[PDB]
């Protein structure tokens, strides 16, 4: 055990953590792979998502090569403070942390040739600007940008270790509201005022689950809309009954819209849910407005003809609206 202890002491004796490997030489190549433990929250209100992952980085540091020990030295995570590590950060993250119970979830594993394995368990909230025009029939694309903060491409280069197999665990992920249609790994360079920087991107394509919205949002609106047509089958002279049905369904539609509208942030552009809810709101609005013409055209001055046609036009026009809507968004 002391032989190993002496070896580790030698490596860190005179070790300069302020200098990257091969300082002034060819850029150090850093390979990364990720194991995704879970995706926890995907919030439209905050336009972000939470991600718990195992984040591994591989690079070769000749200063950390050792011989005579036919084993890979897994060391206490507190040794990471005594080594050079890439200044990797997540360009689009909002808030992130490394877990610290019972100790900091950090791993340092050395290999004889000088390869360093640096693993972290990270929960990161990352910004995902979502396009909600087709919501809730929408498909999103959320990314995770991995870039070096200080070092340019002359000093550090990134690559996915293992190609398209560099990210695992995606198939096992279960989201209460989305399905992972696909994921991609990209590698590129980004040019700033201070120089070019290496970039690694991980992106997912998310398709939203529509079944939930049918029971919560679409179904109550559909039934109230059908209810508003009950007015067309009541006698023209039942003013109290037809107004009470008409005005209470208009109230009901507002009730439906209000306690649903708090599920979405203040996003001012037209969405798929808005068009359907407003389509049904216009219909109930017209059903109550239709009786104004019916009542006036009898008492103020044929009457059954207008109601008779409404018994067909309103069901027909609503089906035409539904056909156009679903085809356009599906």
């Amino acid at each position: 055990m002391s032989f190993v202890k002496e070896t580790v002491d030698k490596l860190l004796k005179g070790y300069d953590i302020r200098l990257r490997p091969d300082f002034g030489g060819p850029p150090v190549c850093v390979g990364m792979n990720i194991d995704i433990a879970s995706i926890d929250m995907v919030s439209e209100v905050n336009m972000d998502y939470t991600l718990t992952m195992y984040f591994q980085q591989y690079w070769r540091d000749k200063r950390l090569a050792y011989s005579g020990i036919p084993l890979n030295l897994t060391l206490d995570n507190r040794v990471a403070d005594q080594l050079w590590v890439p200044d990797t950060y997540f360009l689009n993250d909002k808030k992130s942390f490394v877990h610290g119970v019972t100790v900091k979830n950090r791993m340092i594993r050395l290999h004889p040739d000088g390869t360093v394995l640096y693993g972290l368990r990270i929960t990161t909230t990352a910004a995902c600007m979502m396009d909600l025009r087709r919501y809730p029939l929408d498909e999103q694309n959320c990314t995770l940008e991995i870039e070096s903060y200080g070092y340019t491409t002359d000093d550090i280069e990134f690559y996915w270790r293992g190609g398209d197999k560099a990210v695992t665990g995606v198939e096992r992920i279960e989201l209460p509201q989305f399905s992972i249609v696909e994921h991609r790994l990209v590698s590129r360079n980004v040019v700033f005022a201070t120089g070019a920087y290496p970039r690694l991107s991980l992106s997912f394509r998310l398709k939203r689950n529509i079944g939930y919205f049918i029971l919560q949002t679409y179904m109550p609106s559909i039934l109230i809309t059908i209810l508003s047509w009950v007015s067309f089958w009541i006698n023209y002279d039942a003013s109290a009954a037809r107004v009470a049905l008409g005005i209470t369904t208009v109230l009901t539609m507002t009730t439906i819209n209000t306690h649903l509208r708090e599920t979405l942030p203040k996003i001012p552009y037209v969405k798929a849910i808005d068009m359907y809810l407003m389509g049904c709101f216009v219909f109930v609005f017209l059903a109550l407005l239709e009786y104004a013409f019916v009542n006036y055209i009898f008492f103020g001055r044929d009457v059954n003809a207008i109601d008779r046609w409404s018994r067909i036009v309103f069901p027909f026009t609503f089906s035409l609206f539904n056909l156009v809507y679903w085809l356009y968004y599906v």
């Binding site: 950090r106 029971l215 039934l223 009470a244 209470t248």
Partner: protein, 343 residues
């Protein structure tokens, strides 16, 4: 104290806390047990639960053998950080807390033989994936998995201090659950393979069953009473159109209010739970009660009701007479089928 102090300073002499005991020589065996001081609240919206535990870890380090008057030493919080301890973490943990009031909530003991008992007080938030198809009459097994983050099974193996059933102990006053009952737990262990190698994983599942009384008084009873109230319209005379229209339409608005609120407590899942079907059927009944009067009113001939002293009058609808039996009976049958299926 001086004699004792010298022993402590000698213990860590030449001691490297970056190397596990028996490095390159054998496997470090860690014996663990848990004492749950309070099984905290469970969150359906976040699919997580809280748990307060005394996480006890035990292992052997020959480098820490000592001789003296006492056979057991209670180390300070500072000593525990000067020596090597397992890097145990929770696989499904979300955001855990190590309590630091007033001092670090840790304890490290050493026996003369070099056996280390190491305890800490933690509040752990953990992932509990829930299949809520039978909600609110659902049961779940919330797991709690832990192991070494960095050391593979060839280096560090975990074990339970005593029999696995007797290794996870819950305090008698530990249940901090408002909506669940802690039926019990099962204790197991296995192996997990990852990109960095194979690791020993110690697992514990807490079996929970949801209390239904909240949803009966909040959701089921108002929904049942609303359905009953919709059928009370069948006993009103057919000529009171404004009254039976207001009766039916306002019962529909009550179901809409109840149906929306019930879902908002649920996490945003996209399948029908047990409560969804009950609300959907109740919605259909209240919807069908207003459609039924739409049919009755379509066959009413006279706008005036029976005057009480008999000019002809409308007869009592045969649709109403049958609905006074069919609707209560179908709803009664639906409740036996629903409650027997899920209970």
């Amino acid at each position: 104290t001086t004699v004792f102090t010298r022993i402590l300073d000698r213990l860590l002499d030449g001691y490297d806390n970056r190397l596990r005991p028996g490095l390159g020589e054998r496997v470090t065996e860690v014996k663990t047990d848990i004492f749950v001081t309070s099984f905290g609240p469970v969150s359906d919206h976040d699919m997580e639960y809280t748990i307060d535990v005394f996480f006890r870890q035990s292992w052997k380090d020959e480098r820490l053998k000592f001789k003296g008057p006492m056979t057991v030493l209670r180390l300070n919080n500072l000593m525990a950080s000067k020596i090597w301890t397992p890097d145990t973490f929770f696989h499904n943990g979300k955001k855990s807390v190590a309590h630091n009031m007033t001092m670090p909530n840790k304890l490290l003991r050493i026996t003369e033989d070099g056996t280390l008992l190491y305890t800490m007080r933690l509040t752990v938030r953990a992932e509990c994936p829930m299949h809520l198809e039978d909600f609110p009459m659902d049961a779940h097994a919330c797991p709690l998995k832990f192991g070494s983050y960095a050391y593979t099974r060839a280096e560090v193996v975990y074990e339970w201090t005593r029999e696995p059933a007797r290794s996870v102990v819950v305090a008698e006053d530990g249940s901090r659950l408002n909506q669940y009952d802690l039926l019990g737990q099962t204790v197991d262990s296995g192996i997990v393979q990852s990109s960095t190698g194979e690791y020993v994983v110690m697992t514990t599942h807490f079996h929970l069953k949801r209390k239904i009384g909240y949803f009966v008084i909040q959701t089921y009873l108002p929904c049942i009473m609303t359905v009953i109230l919709s059928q009370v319209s069948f006993w009103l005379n057919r000529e009171s159109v404004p009254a039976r229209t207001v009766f039916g339409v306002t019962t529909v608005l009550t179901m809409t209010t109840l149906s929306i609120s019930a879902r908002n407590s649920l996490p945003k899942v996209a399948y029908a739970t047990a409560m969804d079907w009950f609300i959907a059927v109740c919605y259909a009944f209240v919807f069908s009660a207003l459609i039924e009067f739409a049919t009755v009113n379509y066959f009413t001939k006279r706008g005036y009701a029976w005057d009480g002293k008999s000019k002809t009058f409308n007869s009592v609808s045969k649709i109403d007479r049958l609905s006074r039996i069919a609707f209560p009976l179908l709803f009664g049958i639906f409740n036996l089928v629903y409650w027997a299926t899920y209970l």
